[PDB]
Design a protein around this ligand. Structure first.
Ligand SMILES: NS(=O)(=O)c1cc(C(=O)O)c(NCc2ccco2)cc1Cl
Ligand SMILES: NS(=O)(=O)c1cc(C(=O)O)c(NCc2ccco2)cc1Cl
Lengths: 832, 831
């Protein structure tokens, strides 16, 4: 593997302009020990983030290529996106940092040669604009060029830092005008001072140093391909942070022991005999610093930001090295950030940003993404001063690192993916501690900008929480949502008591979900968010071709159920007939306590023109649903289409456990039937109108129906009319067995060859039930004609007590021409 | 309803800070700043009131505990978080009110002549004694809790009436101090902001926020209302409206009545003299000099009896302070232990369970009492007032911020039980309120805010998965049930194609109490990578089936959740085992969580059992294969080199034979694996087949120890094993050649399962292969933790069930735990 390549790229990202152009003021403002402290703290947080991103790279997404899929699925759909935004924005503003550094170095280069000084902020702005022009011109195309240029340039950078540690080794009297002393002992003692002359504090110089150590995420996940991408990249990058920390400590100590804080650029201010009062760094010598305690100093350590780069020997090589380092870091940042934006746009967790992904050229680079990154980077370039801008970039890098640490901690704690340890010091608690320390430290720097950072993080969490995108868990890593669903189902199965909640769970026995859409919508009304709907389908046919047909039907009808705004589980079964497959579904479907407890059938509207064997299976389906204590709900809709305008009439005619009252109430809460007034109809005696009405009203207050009105009807149990019974017997006539007219042997033959014939004996035996059904239909047409939905208790009979033709004729006569009617019968156990 | 809970809420909110500190606050801060402080505290309290109003209007009829309301509406995690924070806030607020009462008592002693010691220590001793007497009243005060509160409210309104009457009554003795009734001349000097001795705008707000607290404690905590859905919103919100405006009124009247600098001395009664005095002190003649140059002792700044100086009949006003403070303390000491015991009974904190127990007429926690009134005395030791007040303010702000953020989070993420339907509620209002609470939480104190942030974050981390690991703790099914709904829908909506294959097992063992080791072995390779459904076919009468199935389901699910098994007990009712297994294979599971493999224990004692049962058990194999399922036949011994998991790969069945050992290895008990993969290949360059199988293994991430290629299969075994097999199958063998044709025909049609001599002659090579494989397993794999071999398979009706089970018994005769695995041709590197 190219541990060499990863090392050189991570180094070149760290070894930028903040590496060696500001450390002079870092040690001049603070001292030796305090600079060592800030370097060590930046090292601690950087190595915690390095261990975190090492845990990202080596395991959990070892096979997975690319940064963003790994950071998303190996962590969580929520956690990856925020990291992407903040770290991309941090790179975008780092571009501004490094071009400002190049610009101020160019200003210093021009100042000595130029006879006059143009506006300094304007000079920095125009030079930075030109540098970003070169940056984009390089970043249009080419990656092997940077892959070689990094190895080309790291040697020159090491030569530059060697020139720093060697320029003091050669002293010179011409170097004495500037306050230069060669590795003297007094300088280190002078510079080991904990609080110093500049008003800025410790956390200020912490911000001034911190972005230099940032950028380690580039080689771990942002880096892609480059031969071996795993199992040795973490060790190489960790070694990179370690060696950068060692060289930072070395150069800080060397510069602190090198040069005194304030200096006078003159041959004067040298005292022949003054051993007392220690005016300069060299107390007995006092070569340079005198009379500049209150006067501004031209070439001071803290007063001049770049004195170490000017007083180092062979300084043109230093000047070239500054350009090389800052341009290399700028190229790295500006090839990173736009592709980060484009990657998050392509994954489209946030469709509001999705159009930024362009892929204009042969490479997938975003042209409009390049323009947007150019604009925002130049916007931060508009601030031509580096001292206050550097904390801003520090804030977003350190915040992104804190989010990475907390994401790694949450991934280790939850371990929804594989997420092996596969690392030394893989501990999640140390990552949590690093994240907390990062949060506090980010706060201490620029409390207002920090508060805006928490605001942005909370807003990102707010957006990603309510909106669940089928991006990474949805594509190629469905194991995450599978395990979440499995864990939630196991948790649900752990509840001890089920008697508290009836929880209406429906098994809709409609074969084709695309067919009968209004009935599926009506079922979805009462089970949308209160219960489980399972749209069963019994596929009969050859068993050899059964499995492929069932699979393709599952795919197609599940796509249909998801496309329409429904929450249904398509469950297909293979059986010889309807009854066997329905038995399969009713006794076996569901997981744990997500098992259907009501059976929902559509009214068989073609029972007149269908074979009576199918009607027998329909009625026996009613009966063996009642055997398993299911609740039968029969829906008869005009399929040529529901609108809620006035009322939803409920006809409480039987105590079925309260299902026929529970379903209408669940209809009201869906905001489609919000403007619908429940008007319960009950059957009581004329003398008992007040008692029944009052008790029923209290019973609804127990169901919390909040009835509009309750009307008691004495019209039931009367002879319906001459016409309606005529129509009923005309409906019966094709299936009626006229045993009176036929001979007894002929009647027995016609009964045995077709046992579904309705006879004259049980027609007169069940006369009162038939008259009750017809009378109820008359009352429905009179009182419930203007109603959105009608709910009544469906009639039942003992198994074999009635012919199937008679039972379906009762169901047809009861619901003849009404609006959508919902005949409900429930198991006798209470639903409260 | 209104007056039942308004009295309690007004007693709670009108506390110690109404009387002694309001004058001081409107002295340090101007009247404009006092109005700003009271108004913005009112904004915070009203936002919390709308949040808790939505919480109460969430659709459950009556919840006893307000914490339990938070729990059933938002969830166990947030419910526990607000419960703990609010309980601690009430516990420390009890100490605050005790310190306030002790302050009034000690400064009344200073009003009198008797003073035992320095007033600072007198605060400590009086606070301790008052904690003792409040314990004496606290244990059982049912008549004091209900009957005395209306009297206390009457006394409090009486006291505020005397305050107004005192504002409207000038007197000569009030003239040396600051007292000028409702005049602009001192309103001019008093309007200005005059902060003194390190005081800031947020510090006076930090001590003022204790006054506007406990809006939940007054009415919502008790949970005894005629209309809990509707009276709770009107009980609190209107109370705030009848509270804070009264506050504002005082903030005006004091600012209009008493001067910012008042000399207690009677010496500086200036004669009517022509002196300018641009300061408002001499606008009316009395100078109030030398109290601003030197330390002062009166005038909204250096005294707190200035409000008592305003009001006549000062015993009545002092009784007003006493009644208000003790009523607030009594409300807090009732609120906190009840919520704390509800936390323990909800089992969110297992270590806290010892606090739950209590005895009495109504069960109350004595452990909670002793801990709260111990930490109260711990805060009594800090006698300094404006240091106690900020930490109670911070903790109440923590409770309110957590409430608002949790309500907003439940509204945002579309939580399952979220239909509040409150008259005027907005989720954005709650979010803004939580943000404002966090900001003003920080600004008043940084270390306290940091400690609160770190403790609530640690609590959130603890309740993430450590508590939902086994027992999440919610006794309400809904927050679980509907939740799984979306997740199963979250599983159903994804287009998995055939890319995602997971081991989804349908174990067929009727009694999970029997064969626990087999269930553990199945759980080993399906713990976190698939679905495991233990299925039971209940045989018996149909009439008593449902109750028997319900009892068995409850018992076996409790057993499966007690032992660390993640399984679903799925019972089906059928006449025979084959029909129930067909039910479970066809229909069990929902969405993408449907069984993919069939797990069958090896039918030991099949020699003793009737051959019809063996025939049905064998027909289970052929039914599973038809529905395209995978069959594993574990012959784990039920009595319970080095550690090794041997894999004999003799057939290409979709890689399940290799997938099962890999899933075994990624477990704690099988961490040491040393997988040895044996394969049968014809005699050739062995290394070719070895490296091809090695590449196929490296696809599976198996980390093999060695692939051994053995060609000793397909040879005649030893004669001992063959005759042993012959004696095994002898009782079930129809010797058609030995006997006559018609006896054989009678025995065949009577017993179709009899194995003929023709089946033995046809399948001689297969039988020899099975018994030779058994010899090879004994020779090569005698010492191993697990053996996994491809399952023998025959076409339907080709072999008798006796011969088939004799093959399965001969193959696995005296071996370690052996799994005979056959899979559908699906899992070709798809996992
Ligand atoms: N309401 S119905 O009688 O016309 C009806 C109709 C159907 C239906 O076929 O849609 C159905 N599904 C079972 C099935 C058979 C073939 C495919 O699915 C069930 C019923 Cl009850
Ligand atoms: N693996 S087995 O053949 O010995 C077996 C064994 C059992 C078993 O009895 O545990 C079982 N349960 C079904 C049942 C019927 C009546 C009671 O349970 C099913 C099977 Cl396949």
């Amino acid at each position: 593997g190219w541990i060499k390549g990863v090392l050189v790229r991570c180094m070149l990202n760290i070894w930028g302009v903040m590496l060696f152009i500001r450390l002079s003021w870092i040690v001049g403002q603070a001292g030796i020990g305090l600079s060592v402290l800030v370097i060590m703290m930046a090292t601690v947080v950087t190595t915690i983030t390095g261990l975190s991103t090492s845990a990202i790279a080596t395991n959990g997404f070892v096979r997975g290529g690319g940064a963003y899929y790994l950071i998303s699925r190996s962590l969580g759909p929520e956690f990856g996106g925020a990291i992407g935004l903040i770290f991309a924005f941090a790179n975008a503003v780092a571009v501004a940092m490094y071009v400002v550094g190049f610009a101020e170095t160019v200003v210093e280069l021009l100042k000595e040669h130029s006879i006059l000084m143009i506006d300094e902020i304007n000079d920095i702005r125009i030079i930075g604009a030109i540098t970003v022009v070169i940056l984009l011109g390089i970043s249009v195309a080419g990656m092997e060029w940077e892959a070689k240029a990094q190895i080309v340039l790291l040697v020159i950078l090491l030569l530059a830092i060697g020139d720093f540690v060697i320029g003091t080794f050669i002293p010179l009297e011409s170097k004495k005008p500037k306050g230069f002393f060669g590795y003297k002992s007094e300088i280190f003692n002078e510079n080991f001072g904990p609080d110093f002359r500049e008003e800025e504090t410790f956390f200020s110089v912490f911000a001034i140093f911190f972005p230099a150590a940032t950028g380690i995420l580039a080689g771990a996940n942002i880096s892609g391909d480059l031969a071996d991408p795993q199992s040795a990249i973490p060790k190489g990058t960790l070694l990179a942070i370690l060696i950068t920390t060692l060289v930072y400590v070395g150069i800080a100590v060397s510069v602190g022991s090198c040069v005194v804080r304030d200096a006078t650029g003159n041959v004067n201010d040298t005292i022949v005999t003054e051993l007392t009062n220690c005016t300069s760094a060299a107390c007995k010598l006092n070569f340079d610093f005198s009379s500049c305690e209150s006067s501004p100093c031209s070439y001071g350590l803290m007063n001049n930001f770049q004195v170490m780069s000017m007083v180092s020997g062979f300084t043109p090589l230093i000047s070239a090295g500054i350009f090389s380092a800052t341009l290399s870091s700028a190229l790295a940042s500006l090839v990173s950030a736009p592709k980060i934006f484009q990657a998050l746009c392509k994954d489209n967790i946030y469709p509001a940003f999705q159009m930024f992904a362009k892929g204009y050229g042969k490479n997938n680079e975003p042209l409009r993404g390049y323009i947007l990154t150019f604009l925002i980077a130049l916007g931060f370039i508009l601030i031509a001063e580096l001292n206050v801008i550097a904390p801003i970039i520090s804030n977003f890098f350190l915040a992104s690192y804190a989010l990475i640490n907390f994401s790694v901690f949450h991934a280790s704690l939850a371990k929804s993916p594989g997420w092996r340890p596969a690392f030394k010091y893989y501990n999640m608690w140390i990552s949590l501690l690093g994240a907390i320390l990062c949060c506090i430290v980010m706060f201490v720097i620029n409390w207002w900008a920090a508060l805006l950072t928490y605001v942005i993080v909370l807003g990102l969490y707010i957006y990603v929480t309510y909106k669940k995108p089928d991006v990474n868990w949805g594509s190629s890593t469905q194991a995450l949502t599978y395990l979440n669903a499995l864990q939630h189902s196991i948790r649900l199965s752990g509840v001890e008591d089920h008697v508290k909640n009836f929880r209406p769970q429906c098994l809709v026995m409609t074969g084709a979900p695309n067919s009968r859409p209004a009935l599926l919508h009506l079922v979805h009304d009462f089970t949308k968010n209160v219960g489980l709907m399972i749209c069963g389908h019994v596929h009969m046919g050859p068993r050899r071709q059964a499995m492929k047909e069932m699979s393709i039907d599952q795919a197609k009808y599940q796509r249909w159920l998801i496309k329409n705004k429904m929450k249904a589980f398509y469950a297909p079964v293979h059986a010889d007939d309807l009854r066997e497959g329905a038995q399969y579904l009713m006794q076996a479907a569901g997981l744990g306590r997500m098992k259907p407890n009501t059976l929902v059938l559509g009214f068989k509207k073609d029972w007149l023109q269908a074979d009576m064997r199918d009607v027998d299976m329909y009625i026996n389906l009613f009966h063996d649903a009642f055997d398993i204590q299911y609740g039968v709900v029969v829906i008869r809709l005009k399929e040529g289409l529901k609108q809620g305008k006035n009322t939803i009439d409920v006809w409480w005619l039987f105590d079925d456990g309260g299902l026929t009252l529970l379903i209408p109430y669940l209809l009201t809460t869906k905001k489609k039937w919000k403007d619908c007034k429940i008007r319960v109809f009950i059957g009581g005696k004329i003398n008992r109108i007040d008692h029944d009405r009052r008790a029923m009203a209290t019973l609804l207050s127990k169901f919390r129906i909040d009835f509009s009105d309750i009307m008691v009807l004495g019209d039931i149990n009367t002879k319906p009319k001459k016409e309606n019974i005529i129509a009923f017997e005309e409906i019966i006539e094709p299936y009626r067995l006229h045993e009176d007219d036929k001979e007894q042997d002929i009647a027995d033959k016609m009964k045995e060859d077709e046992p579904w014939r309705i006879t004259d004996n049980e027609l007169e035996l069940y006369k009162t039930k038939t008259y009750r059904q017809i009378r109820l239909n008359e009352l429905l047409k009179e009182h419930s004609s203007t109603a959105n939905i009608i709910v009544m208790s469906l009639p039942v009979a003992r198994k074999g007590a009635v012919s199937s033709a008679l039972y379906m004729a009762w169901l047809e006569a009861l619901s003849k021409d009404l609006p959508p009617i919902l005949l409900v019968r429930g198991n006798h156990q209470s639903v409260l």
